[PDB]
Design a protein around this motif. Structure first.
Motif: not given
Lengths: 1145, 111, 285, 165
Positions: C18-20, C220, C222-223, C254-257
């Motif tokens: 999570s960044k880190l 990333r 990400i989504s 972090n995963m999220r649409p």
């Protein structure tokens, strides 16, 4: 306090107080296996650290045993922080339980006999604290009854299963009214007066002394439509009184206060002159509607704790009697604390030169409503928030981000974005916009967040950081709860806020800044840290982990976290006033910012230029003025005092004690309730000797004249530079002038400030032949460096520049008898000859002094002035209400120490201790303290905070000097005396590589003198002050035995870095305290053993060091200090990449 | 030295006088702290944008609790009947106790 | 209070990001191999200390705030660890987890975690760089673009498939139409990925039948990839939206649409089941 | 010492160490070393937990050296290393002796002659099977496990415990 009797008949008296961590050890010892059936696998640290409140009850003997923790969600997973309201309503649809009005318990224990009393008292305490808490919910697995203790308070209610399992939990309830009533309200009757009359007289005589004893009764009779009077009743008797009146003199309010947010105090009217077509500060909104606010205008209430909730309830009934009126006003006179009733009100903001005898407070009819609720962003909110934000500065940005999160589920980069609205009676008025942090490590390195968290129990997942938060201010009183719900809903423990220096970039408010609305009230300011200078090239991997190492756009940190979110944080309304900052004054403002127990509201700073440090200088401007190195631009940015400090520009021009008022020239008036004077000493005009070189007198004649003030006109080409604003003014003028190219310029005064100016001008680029430099002989022959080798180095650098150097001289008259402005040519007298010099420009550093103007303003005050300003050794002037400190101050002759003054010490230590004294007048949480014993009046107590002077020097040297406070004495006199010190010195001043220290025959270090062409780590070296040679790695042997090559490089080595680390000094305090502990029956402390051996109470053939060291290493105390160190390494290792303890392996 | 206490009441709202201070807008030109600026009109929204929710009754519904005295105090006894006779006029001279006070005092002494 | 945890979870959490790297805070993790020094020398888990044993007692490694180290783990080679699991039950605020297949499968599936380097210094931990993340157990992976390019990460999973919804080029399988799947659009809500999910799912499934090793990315982590995983899981198991979402939630937190993608997934559910079985009104979406 | 386990046998001054000494490090590594100011300030040899020798010369408390030698005494180069390679594929004992003194089947890295017992492989420390992805230690217990990259390296490069053909 309450009395409790054990069934044994033993009696105790008990107090409740809000938990402090030392309590935790004691309370944890109470815990029982029985309690573990209720709450087992609780370890208190976690639950406290997430707590919404920790409450302890304790006895007069400080036996501590009664405790409970409460939070905004149940134990045992019976519901969630996500939600619980429907499930509990499914238990009982009638219970109005919601986060507005609900908390759950999670632990208790007490020694049983007192325990049963204590539980009742704690319950009463909680309901007394948190008035909407109408219930406490208590829940257990169904197989348990509560048993006697809790059965005395809680009653049983429909059960909840485990959310997962076929494991049921039973639910039990306690009612506020059972343990702390509401009031009852009724409209007053004459009989009611007699109850109340003693209450008023307890509070005050004055009203009765005007009106006579039956004034309250006559007021009760007076009532009509324009004025109603109403009381609360208990036990069939009254003990509260409130008055209201319909009248409000709107012209006064419309002048005095910016009702921009508060148009509503008037009706609407179609002209709506709510805006103009600095005049905006002059402009006033011309409302044209009708008065629809009403005032309260008399209030007292008390059993006293009954007031706390019940005052709020009065507002409900009061509004009922004014169908036409929707705002309540109250005006509050200064010095009066915010008792509970006012605290709900918004504090109105007076206009840019309002001055009123009162502060003003507002509350609104809607506040009575209770459908206030939070929900997380959905579509329909767009319309409501559009209606809401229409006046908001970044209204577009805030709306756009709300819309974005309604689409995206993310911020634009992708990281967490959370947006929250407050919903009320099916209406919206709240918005919050918050982001999830990840530079938490950067925060923790820059600021002491650790003061308010035990971070290791928290996790990098858990942190929110605010960006936008705006509200109907009426709700702001509830809003402290709003932060609680935000933290719950977001599953965050912390909110953070960054205050960004308001100078910003030279134009741009860089987007690191945020548009902060009201939230700043509820946060706390976090004390700023001090990074060590890291020799990263000597470290590589072993650096402080590079994120922490980074610079960033330097700013102040403000914070809240759940356990704070209840603390009323009682405001102080007192007008406390602080005068000037030069050399010192800022230190006082820091301490009053940096104590979260309190909240200053009326505090104001008056200064020639207001705040310090405004300017984005470039460092050459700093080159002008020798510095004390105790502050810098980033320090001022961190301290960010403007966030709370109110500021006025220009110095003050008269005192006037009888009003308790102070003048800024042109009859602009400020009022004080405490007055702290701290102008520093300032330079004053270098008065020409008047008697001339052209008049050939004997020098002592001229010396007597040289003492006198100047009272002629001021040369436009003569310069006095107290401040960075002065330096910039001069420098811009010089750049817009020829002289820098060509001129011949005098800098006069033998002080370090001259040499710093000379170096500065050489940096600007004037030829050294341009530069002429004259330094009159002193009243006491201590050089401004007391280091003849370095002085000689500087003088040789001046020779290489060709600066024109003149000892012994005294200032005969520039322009002689011709008109002085501008100067063009100048004369100097000497012990043997005339001098003439050519002077395009003249710089003074001749003598610092109190300002003539302010000196006169003091003498008008008839505050005692003996050429410098007179105080006792506890800062009292001849006025009990006025106190003063810093080098402008001096003690009564009785102290027989006119040589010893605040001038001698550090600035910061002075301001810190002065504030500590003055806090004792302000702070209710420490006990109020007596005036000093005369025994203190006997003496000036020995401060120790070393005094810093530091400079850049002709030929681009750096220079730094630090001192124990002393009466001056020449270096060679002290060095030739044997009864002083060992010195330690690695140097060649001309070669730009120089240290000197002096150590004292007590083998501590109590001097620094360093001369350099290297950017020294002064912050690190300042910690060298007061250190024992042992602490410096048995430095003395290192100096003796050809072991050190030089000092600068040797301090690079990692072990010293802890000595630089700030916590390590407090660890040294711990280590001393450990030695103060007594470990074994037979033994004195190591301290007492030393005391005996050193005082010849024991006598030896070995020297005491050998005996003591042997006895210590033989003793177990060594293990205890070693263990303590290792532990501190564990904590500090987060900061520090170089300390070994289990944890490295 | 200095205290914190008063009769804790307002005043300057009085319609009778804008008088005694003359000019009240007479101070130096302020430079406020940040926090009040964050409170001020550009950071805040205005009351007229906020909804006026509908009803007094909604507030009454939101009430939750039984008040202190209202019920246990109830009895069949007529109240004014408690009152002693006493001869004090209806309109006492200012500084005298007004009539109703005397009645309460006498009855309370008797009880 | 001793619990079994799958090695896939170990690979999720120990290279959770999570960044880190979460490894750059100790309260995140502890892991303590009771066994021989010599095994530990030959290697250990990627922050795992070496236990000290003494007369068959264990010497408590208070290297960290054991009281609250939120994830708290032990491994032998297989599953003396068990009793250490027992002793730990007194300690952490969370329950205590055993690593099912303490070594043999976890690093047998992911060798790289073995190393002779003991500690990683705070700079070195913070400097760490994540391997790709695993979605479908052993079979399909999730990655961010600089992982997908990273030569070592790609090679070490013996990977050759890409699966992505983005505009931005990547170095390998260019034009290999059967061992590349790539779609191009912004993460903009009007990107009607609903249809593309069928192709994506069939392509991944085919690699399942082929046992090809597959990485998924949406630049990333990400989504877009998240929604595609929701579709993949729902169609692969005939599961509800809520089940797939719950799995995804751990898969990488972090995963999220996005809410239009949520609508597309809701229609994907209604197409597969015939009706909405999950209600989007909760915030947990 | 205790708090990490370090050990020293030598002289102390001011209580901090200044020595010509043998030494032990909580690696259970052994060392022989000289000290200054409580730091190593020496040319000194570090004897591994596995006996082998690293060398360390100390400048101001930092190391500047190159030498290594194995626990068998094989002299080593960290670069270019000319050993059992293009010039001659002979091991340390086979280069020193030539043909091992009696030609026991230790004309190979370990013998007397046997099949690798479990299956698995030889890679000198440990037995590993590509059909199991597990490494084992010569006590037939266990060693670090490995997925495809290391598995594939073992599969191609080294010697399985195949059946002896």
């Amino acid at each position: 306090m309450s009395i409790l009797t054990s069934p044994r008949g033993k009696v105790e008296v008990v107090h409740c107080r809000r938990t402090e961590s030392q309590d935790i050890f004691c309370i944890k010892n109470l815990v029982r296996k029985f309690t573990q059936k209720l709450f087992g696998r609780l370890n208190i640290i976690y639950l406290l650290e997430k707590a919404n409140l920790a409450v302890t009850v304790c006895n007069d003997k400080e036996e501590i045993m009664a405790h409970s923790i409460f939070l905004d969600y149940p134990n045992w997973n019976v519901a969630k922080q996500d939600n619980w309201i429907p499930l509990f309503r499914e238990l009982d649809k009638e219970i109005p339980c919601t986060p507005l009005n609900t908390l759950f318990m999670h632990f208790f224990v007490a020694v049983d006999e007192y325990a049963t009393g204590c539980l009742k008292e704690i319950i009463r305490t909680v309901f007394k604290a948190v008035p909407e808490l109408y219930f406490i919910f208590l829940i257990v697995p169904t197989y348990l009854s509560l048993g006697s203790t809790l059965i005395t308070v809680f009653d049983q209610v429909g059960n909840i299963p485990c959310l997962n399992y076929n494991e049921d939990f039973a639910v039990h309830i306690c009612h506020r009214h059972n343990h702390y009533p509401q009031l009852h309200i009724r409209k007053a009757r004459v009989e009611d007066h007699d109850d109340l009359m003693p209450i008023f007289m307890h509070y005050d005589n004055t009203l009765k002394e005007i009106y006579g004893e039956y004034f309250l009764a006559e007021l009760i009779e007076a009532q009509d439509k324009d004025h109603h009077a109403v009381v609360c009743e208990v036990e069939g008797k009254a003990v509260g009184f409130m008055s209201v009146c319909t009248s409000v003199n709107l012209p006064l309010l419309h002048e005095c206060f910016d009702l921009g947010p508060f148009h509503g105090f008037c009706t609407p009217h179609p002209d709506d002159i709510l805006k103009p077509s600095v005049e905006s500060s002059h402009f006033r909104p011309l409302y044209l509607g009708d008065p629809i606010a009403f005032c309260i205008q008399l209030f007292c209430i008390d059993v006293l704790i009954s007031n706390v909730s019940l005052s709020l309830d009065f507002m409900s009934f009061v509004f009922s009697l004014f169908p036409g009126k929707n705002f309540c006003l109250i005006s509050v006179p200064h010095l009066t604390p915010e008792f509970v009733l006012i605290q709900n009100f918004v504090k109105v903001v007076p206009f840019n030169n309002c001055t009123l005898d009162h502060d003003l407070y507002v509350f609104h009819r809607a506040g009575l409503l209770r459908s206030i609720t939070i929900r997380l962003a959905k579509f329909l909110d767009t319309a409501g928030v559009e209606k809401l934000v229409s006046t908001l500065l970044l209204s577009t940005k805030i709306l756009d981000d709300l819309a974005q999160y309604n689409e995206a589920g993310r911020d634009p980069d992708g990281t967490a974005l959370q947006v929250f609205v407050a919903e009320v009676a099916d209406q919206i008025v709240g918005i919050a916009v918050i982001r999830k942090e990840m530079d938490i490590e950067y925060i923790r390195s820059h600021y002491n967040i650790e003061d308010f968290i035990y971070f290791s129990h928290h996790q990098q997942e858990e942190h929110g950081r605010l960006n936008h938060f705006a509200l109907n201010p009426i709700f702001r009183h509830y809003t402290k709860f709003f932060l609680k719900e935000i933290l719950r809903l977001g599953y965050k423990s912390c909110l953070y806020y960054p205050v960004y220096p308001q100078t910003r970039e030279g134009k741009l408010q860089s987007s690191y800044s945020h548009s902060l609305t009201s939230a700043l009230h509820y946060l706390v300011p976090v004390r700023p840290r001090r990074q060590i200078v890291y020799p990263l090239e000597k470290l590589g991997i072993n650096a402080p982990s590079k994120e922490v190492s980074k610079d960033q756009v330097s700013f102040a940190l403000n914070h809240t976290n759940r356990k704070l979110t209840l603390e009323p944080k009682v405001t102080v309304n007192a007008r406390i006033v602080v005068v000037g900052a030069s050399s010192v004054g800022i230190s006082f403002l820091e301490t009053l910012v940096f104590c979260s127990h309190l909240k200053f509201n009326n505090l104001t700073l008056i200064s020639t230029h207001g705040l310090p440090g405004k300017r984005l200088l470039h460092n050459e401007q700093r080159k002008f003025l020798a510095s004390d190195h105790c502050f810098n631009d980033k320090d001022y940015a961190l301290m960010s005092l403007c966030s709370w400090v109110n500021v006025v520009v220009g110095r003050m021009t008269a005192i006037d004690r009888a009003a308790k008022q102070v003048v800024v020239s042109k009859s602009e008036i400020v009022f004080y309730d405490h007055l702290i004077l701290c102008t520093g000493l300032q330079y004053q005009v270098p008065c020409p000797t008047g008697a001339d070189t052209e008049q050939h007198l004997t020098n002592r004649e001229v010396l007597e004249l040289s003492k006198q003030r100047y009272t002629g006109t001021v040369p436009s080409n003569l310069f006095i530079l107290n401040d960075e604003e002065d330096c910039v003014r001069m420098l811009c003028w010089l750049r817009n002038s020829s002289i820098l190219t060509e001129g011949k310029v005098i800098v006069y005064g033998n002080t370090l400030d001259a040499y710093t100016t000379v170096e500065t001008l050489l940096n600007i680029g004037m030829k050294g032949s341009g530069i002429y430099f004259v330094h009159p002989p002193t009243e006491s022959n201590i050089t401004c460096i007391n280091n003849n080798d370095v002085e000689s180095a500087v003088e040789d650098a001046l020779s290489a520049a060709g600066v024109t150097v003149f000892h012994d001289a005294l200032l005969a008259q520039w322009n002689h008898g011709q008109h002085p402005d501008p100067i063009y040519n100048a004369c100097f007298t000497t012990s043997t000859k005339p001098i003439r010099l050519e002077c395009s420009a003249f710089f003074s550093f001749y003598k610092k002094n109190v300002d003539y103007e302010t000196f006169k303003a003091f003498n008008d005050a008839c505050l005692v002035y003996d050429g410098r300003l007179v105080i006792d050794t506890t800062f009292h002037t001849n006025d009990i209400a006025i106190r003063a400190a810093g080098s402008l101050t001096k003690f009564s002759n009785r102290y027989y120490s006119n040589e010893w003054t605040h001038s001698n010490f550090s600035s910061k230590e002075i301001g810190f201790q002065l504030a500590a004294a003055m806090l004792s007048l302000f702070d209710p949480t420490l006990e109020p303290v007596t005036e000093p014993p005369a025994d203190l009046d006997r003496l000036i107590p020995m401060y120790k905070g070393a005094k810093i002077q530091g400079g850049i020097l002709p030929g681009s040297y750096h220079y730094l000097h630090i001192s124990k406070p002393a009466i001056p004495t020449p270096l060679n006199l002290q060095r030739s005396q044997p009864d002083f010190g060992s010195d330690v010195v690695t140097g060649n001043a001309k070669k730009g590589t120089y240290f000197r220290l002096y150590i004292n025959n007590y083998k501590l270090v109590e001097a620094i003198t360093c001369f350099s062409k290297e950017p020294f780590p002064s912050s690190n070296y300042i910690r060298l002050f007061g250190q024992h040679e042992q602490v410096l790695n048995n430095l003395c042997t290192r100096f003796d035995d050809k072991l050190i090559p030089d000092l600068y490089s040797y301090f690079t080595e990692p072990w010293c870095m802890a000595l630089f680390h700030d916590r390590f000094i407090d660890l040294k305090k711990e280590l001393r305290q450990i030695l103060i502990s007594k470990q074994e029956e037979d033994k004195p402390t190591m301290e007492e053993i030393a005391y005996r051996l050193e005082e010849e109470e024991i006598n030896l053939n070995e020297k005491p060091q050998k005996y003591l060291q042997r006895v210590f290493e033989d003793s177990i105390y060594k293990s205890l200090l070693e263990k303590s160190i290792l532990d501190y390494l564990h904590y500090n290792q987060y900061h520090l990449p170089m300390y070994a303890w289990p944890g490295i392996i | 030295p200095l205290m914190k206490q008063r009769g804790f009441y307002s005043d300057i709202l009085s319609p009778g006088t804008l008088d005694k201070l003359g000019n009240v807008c007479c101070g130096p030109y302020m430079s406020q702290n940040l926090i009040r600026q964050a409170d001020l009109d550009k950071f805040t929204p205005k009351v007229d944008s906020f909804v006026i929710p509908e009803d007094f009754q909604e507030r009454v519904e939101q009430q939750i609790i039984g008040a202190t005295t209202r019920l246990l105090t109830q009895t069949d006894f007529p109240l004014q009947s408690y009152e002693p006779k006493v001869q004090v006029p209806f309109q006492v001279l200012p500084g005298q106790c007004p009539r109703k006070i005397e009645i309460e005092r006498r009855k309370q002494q008797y009880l | 209070d001793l619990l079994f945890c799958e090695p896939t979870e170990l690979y999720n959490i120990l290279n959770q990001v999570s960044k880190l790297s979460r490894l750059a805070e100790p309260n995140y993790l502890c892991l303590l191999d009771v066994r021989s020094k010599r095994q530990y020398d030959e290697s250990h888990v990627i922050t795992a200390l070496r236990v000290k044993k003494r007369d068959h007692q264990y010497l408590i490694p208070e290297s960290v705030d054991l009281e609250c180290v939120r994830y708290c783990i032990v491994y032998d080679s297989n599953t003396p660890a068990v009793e250490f699991g027992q002793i730990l039950i007194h300690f952490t605020r969370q329950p205590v987890y055993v690593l099912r297949g303490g070594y043999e499968c976890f690093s047998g599936m992911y060798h790289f975690f073995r190393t002779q380097k003991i500690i990683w210094m705070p700079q070195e931990l913070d400097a760490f760089q994540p391997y790709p993340v695993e979605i479908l157990p052993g079979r399909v992976y999730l990655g961010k673009i600089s992982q997908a390019c990273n030569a070592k990460m790609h090679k070490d999973l013996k990977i050759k498939a890409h699966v992505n919804i983005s505009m931005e080029t990547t170095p390998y399988f260019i034009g290999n139409a059967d061992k590349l799947l790539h779609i191009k659009l912004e993460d903009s809500p009007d990107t009607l990925l609903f249809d593309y999910f069928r192709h994506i799912c069939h392509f991944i499934e085919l690699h399942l039948r082929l046992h090809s090793v597959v990485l998924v990315f949406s630049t990333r982590g990400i989504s877009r990839s998240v929604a595609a995983v929701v579709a993949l899981l729902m169609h692969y198991n005939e599961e509800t939206l809520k089940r797939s979402w719950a799995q995804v939630k751990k898969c990488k937190t972090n995963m999220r649409p996005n809410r239009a993608f949520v609508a597309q997934l809701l229609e994907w559910e209604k197409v597969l089941h015939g009706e909405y079985l999950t209600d989007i009104s909760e915030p947990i979406y | 010492m205790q708090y990490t386990g370090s050990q020293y046998f030598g002289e102390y001054i001011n209580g901090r160490m200044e020595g010509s000494a043998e030494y032990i490090l909580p690696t259970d590594t052994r060392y022989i070393g000289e000290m200054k100011d409580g730091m190593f300030h020496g040319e000194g040899t570090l004897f591994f937990p596995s006996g082998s020798r690293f060398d360390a010369i100390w400048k101001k408390g930092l190391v500047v050296k190159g030498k290594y030698t194995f626990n068998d005494g094989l002299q080593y180069e960290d670069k270019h290393w000319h050993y059992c390679d293009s010039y001659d594929r002979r091991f340390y004992t086979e280069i020193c002796y030539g043909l091992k003194p009696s030609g026991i089947s230790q004309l190979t890295n370990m013998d007397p002659p046997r099949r690798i017992p479990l299956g698995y492989y030889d890679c000198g420390d440990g037995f590993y099977n590509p059909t199991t992805r597990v490494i084992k230690d010569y006590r037939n217990r266990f060693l670090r496990n490995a997925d495809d990259d290391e598995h594939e390296w073992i599969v191609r490069t080294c010697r399985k415990g195949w059946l002896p053909m």
